[PDB]
Design a binder for this molecule. Structure first.
Ligand SMILES: OC[C@]1(O)OC[C@H](O)[C@@H]1O
Ligand SMILES: OC[C@]1(O)OC[C@H](O)[C@@H]1O
Ligand SMILES: OC[C@]1(O)OC[C@H](O)[C@@H]1O
Ligand SMILES: OC[C@]1(O)OC[C@H](O)[C@@H]1O
Ligand code: NI
Ligand code: NI
Ligand code: NI
Ligand code: NI
Ligand code: NI
Ligand code: NI
Ligand code: NI
Ligand code: NI
Lengths: 388, 388, 388, 388
């Protein structure tokens, strides 16, 4: 009815999102820089719950320890003034030229040691600001050519780095968990751990896997042509959806980071349906870039639209699931039977069950339509508000 | 010098590859069916090591137990006559209309029970023929629309199915392992476990993960735009590369299944380099389709070219790694340093090491070129046989 | 309010769409064949305006001249009984094995001559049934490998074929125009004239270009990652949008042919906006496949949903353009200025205009935001029926 | 034997290629700027024939008329000192913020007039330096959202701009032709005239089409998944290949601009085969970026590798076509018959030829294999230097 967000909806934004100045590989900045304090204040006015940051977004690279304390205190006063929270933070291991061949998996060992120290420094700061999740996006971990990177040795180095970070937070007693953010490419030709599945598999080889989950981004899995709600379902099934980055992407091309709801709208519908039906309770974080065509009024419009589109889709997905005609259609398509065990009776009874093979009427079973198109048109009508 | 294969090179082919009759979604078959015995004999003459099969390739669907024994005995006599082996087998859970919504994750429970019994029947046959690996490709597990498949319930059903199959082989005492073959799409709109990473992650949630690995296919990961040698490296790092399907693919489109070496030739070079340097010792299996333009002479030509291209690339990758100028280039690009631990000295010494942060010269480190382009041009010259 | 189609909405369907039996490259048919007469009757009941056909959909391949006349007369009686029209027809030059290397650009000259005679035979039949457009989809014109097809010689052969067909219809006095339907790949590895742009360029080299236009399909341009409404705009700008195939596609992969509205929903919105604002008056033809999961009740549901989704999107696009707040936003984003000539004053006055260069304030111009994000969120709200 | 380039091989490089400082959307520059004079000298030493430039690469934006003359004179002295030529130039209408919504199709009319004056100024300079081709890449012409750009009005504006530029060069008497460079996306979400086909079609609607051709880039057509040699063949067939940009791209993702030969190596082979067999005589221009991992020694290595790989592939493609076994294979696959007219006898004799339809043996024709796989393996063996 009214799609007004409140801090209760847990919407969060990175400083680097509304603060993106619009520099792209072919053009100069179109907007001036935003003071972090100014972004916190404007986002609070729009109904956001909190903000996130990379170390270098908050404290400019090379800052003296005294300049550092000054930047943090001003930030903390804006948070106190507005009620905004800081649920996640991350490290910039991709902008400075020293990270041109990676941070944790750089071929040069001294760069890998520096990347870990820069990371540990910001974990301390994140805990101080109350963050519960620490994200890692290995944007420069990867290669443009085959001989440049032995990927088994690089995964060893990646494992070593995350194991050391887990040792660090456990030895310090911190209540923070790690979330790896996959991306298949850009800025490297191929990035290691390119999808949610590769990241989930990797985590199972860490020494303390319970401290690590994923931070998937809508557009990154779509850059590989994959179904984002399906990957999120697999992450939820594994118990590893620790955080999520929401935005939009129009297919397989450069990372667009459009506002949430733009891009593949039906995938956004099915994502919100899943998050809300699974009871995901973390932040709904937007990692987006207001297009460089926009002035600052367009930046705030784009940020507001992120939140608005989430709340419209939440209403439509709830109306879909609550509709008795949809519930009947779900039974007609046997979603109830999918949720029942195949063989709770056990292996031996399955083998002795002649109705499962010797006397199974395969032709009768094959003729049964699944009724999925009528179900999908009910979902389309609900999304478009065309139920009457 | 001479690129002649021998059974020692372990090249294997599925019956369904050379026997593909050329039916595609827009056209009729262009070739008559091949008798399996005839394929075994022709492949042996070409230097292959063995063949693989789906149950329905060897025994036509619906066969009586007596027709079954007859088809198997003829096959076994061809194997005895030629020295050919059968290292892998698999189940067809995708062609019959009863599998239109899947086998293990079909919404209908009776279809899921039938799919397991059809599978178990062929595992027994595979063990009898001496197969060491049983492949599962869930070609119909997936969906064209969002509401048709709850993916968490479907992963529960998938886990239940593989757990029951593991219970079966362990209770029977069989020495066979399972290999899941990922594919991102086609014939379903999205297929569950779409990439090597999703399959590896899934396996870690099975009750006896040691019985399960992956069977990646070159073209399937490329249908998601991913780097196949990188995914194979991750599978090798995890200890899960139990088998591999070799073929070629020209980018993101329908599954072409071209002969190996066609498609992305440099990725084929880097794949062979990795397999041979990691000492992969399983079968080099070709899952390919000779194009429907071809008559049977072109089918055998295409099969021979699979083997030929592997052996040329093996020679070029070995020449690359053995070249002293390449070894010097690898050190110049610090591949030796990538293989050294980042912090064997431990967390505490890293934190107290001022050379890792307080006194690290980031500008000096940043200026060091990685020399990857000279290394990659040496690899190009070796691939093209242009070293002089 | 009520999204009921009538024959006035000009919705048409190919016989091969609702009649697709569900055979795909990995599985058998899931539905029995439909008699063309039965499809005409069922589609009329749903509110369709007419049907289209390939020669081989209506008259089975190899039919005797007498069997032929019989199939046509039964069809014509169904059309008379229902009021259905036949606005377009086409030729099947892709299913029979003789067309495995193409019809018009087959390397074998005798096949190319046969393809033209099979085509001419059906043009006569289409005119008899009252078709105004004859579509050509060169599904097999192309190659899997580089040496198999000299593309300059193949374009010569393609031009020769269309020139001869134009000579034929002009010599017979027929009032029919030709529409080339591009597709980038599938079933050939690469298909010639792969996009709307390549087809439009080709037409300009024909002897009588006025007889030829394009028949773009939503999903085909999306298989190349292109923006379909943009390509349709270019076709409309050139005066060549003679017909259109509507369906849905989820990105770059095999040709899904989903029902219209599925796939990229926002692109469907912008397509309907363009067609209706440009006053396109041809048929709105659905070239779709009801998924093979469906029985015949699902086939009719899917066909009805094609029409329903067009009419919902038509209502939302009209509400968008009629909204005074949207009209103000369009002026704020200077769409009115885009439609004004850049230099109606002429070249010399442009060169002497110091306000265009010497005294142009580039910094002031650069600071002006384009306001596109607020405009796009108004379009999203209209699409979702969330204006209040 | 020796793959040493000489100026006779006509290899050219843009100033912006070797001079790319390595700034990407996620990171800072890794290399200092190169003085244009220094690049001219280094490229001459490597065997290049000439260089190309955007206006802003040579003369920094905002330069005074006196600073301008100074930059040009220094450049001209380097050209005189080295023998280097300047065969092409272009305009930068994409970096400055004023071009954020385009140059020729910007919604703001005053920006469109400025873009034309900036262009005309550099055409005069290009003619002075002896360029024969003027390239236009409309990198910012396009949109991220549907309502922001009416594409018919934008094509009107694009046509108006190129028509005015043609009026200008004809009124000045200049001997220069225009080449439009297509790209499907990046930096805009969708770019207008996204492929070679759309550009060729557009040119036919200009007032003086003979002055305009295309400048295709390998990686740009591959960003749409298209076959670059096929698109080049269509451009050659139309008589419009006025220039070409050579580089490499690994599939559908961000524009990588790798050195030529990297990316899809077999497509590079077939491109060189086509260019050399068609007798293309323009510049072989590399539009590439040495990866930001590299220092200046790696920049020159990467530039040299562009030239080296062209010359290796030229030798292998010539060996392929000269091989008598390949010539026999081409006849076996009926490439000779593809080049013969389908119906030089004319329409009426085709209609009366019973051997073309009534008495055509379609089954006999269908059984003939095309022998394309043996031909393609000969091409692979030649590419890899594996003929013995
Ligand atoms: O997507 C990448 C990003 O914007 O920068 C890194 C951080 O993790 C964030 O998600
Ligand atoms: O790729 C799919 C395939 O050809 O059919 C199933 C089997 O696993 C084999 O790999
Ligand atoms: O899309 C291809 C199709 O379904 O078959 C050929 C006809 O042109 C129709 O469009
Ligand atoms: O590819 C784009 C580019 O590098 O910048 C514009 C010029 O046309 C050149 O081709
Ligand atoms: Ni992103
Ligand atoms: Ni992110
Ligand atoms: Ni495949
Ligand atoms: Ni396979
Ligand atoms: Ni289609
Ligand atoms: Ni179509
Ligand atoms: Ni490029
Ligand atoms: Ni270029």
């Amino acid at each position: 009815m009214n799609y007004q967000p409140t801090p209760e909806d847990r919407f969060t934004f990175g400083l680097w999102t509304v603060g993106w100045q619009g520099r792209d590989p072919f053009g100069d900045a179109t907007r001036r820089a935003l003071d972090p304090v100014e972004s916190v204040r404007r986002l609070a006015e729009l109904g956001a719950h909190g903000v996130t940051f990379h170390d270098d977004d908050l404290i400019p690279f090379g800052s003296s320890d005294s300049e550092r304390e000054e930047h943090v205190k001003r930030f903390r006063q804006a948070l106190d003034d507005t009620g905004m929270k800081v649920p996640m933070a991350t490290t910039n291991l991709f902008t400075h030229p020293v990270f041109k061949d990676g941070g944790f998996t750089a071929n040069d060992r001294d760069v890998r040691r520096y990347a870990l120290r820069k990371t540990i420094r910001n974990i301390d700061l994140a805990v101080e600001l109350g963050a519960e999740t620490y994200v890692a996006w290995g944007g420069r971990e990867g290669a443009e050519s085959g001989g440049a990177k032995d990927v088994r040795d690089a995964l060893d180095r990646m494992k070593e780095a995350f194991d050391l970070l887990g040792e660090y937070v456990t030895s310090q007693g911190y209540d923070i968990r790690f979330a790896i953010e996959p991306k298949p490419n850009e800025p490297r030709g191929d990035i290691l751990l390119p999808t949610v599945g590769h990241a989930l598999a990797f985590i199972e080889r860490l020494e303390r896997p319970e401290l690590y989950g994923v931070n998937p981004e809508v557009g990154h899995e779509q850059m590989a042509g994959l179904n984002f709600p399906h990957g999120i379902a697999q992450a939820l099934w594994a118990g590893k959806l620790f955080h999520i980055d929401l935005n939009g992407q129009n297919g397989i091309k450069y990372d667009q980071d459009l506002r949430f709801g733009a891009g593949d709208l039906r995938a956004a519908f099915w994502l919100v349906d899943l998050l809300e039906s699974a009871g995901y309770s973390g932040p709904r974080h937007f990692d987006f870039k207001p297009p460089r065509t926009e002035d600052f009024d367009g930046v705030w419009a784009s940020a507001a639209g992120c939140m608005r589109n989430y709340l419209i889709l939440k209403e439509r997905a709830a109306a879909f699931r609550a509709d008795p005609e949809v519930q009947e259609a779900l039974r007609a398509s046997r979603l109830d039977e999918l949720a029942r065990p195949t063989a709770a009776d056990g292996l031996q009874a399955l083998l002795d069950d002649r109705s499962a093979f010797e006397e199974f009427d395969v032709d009768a079973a094959a003729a049964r339509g699944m009724a999925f198109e009528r179900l999908d048109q009910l979902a389309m009508d609900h999304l478009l508000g065309a139920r009457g």
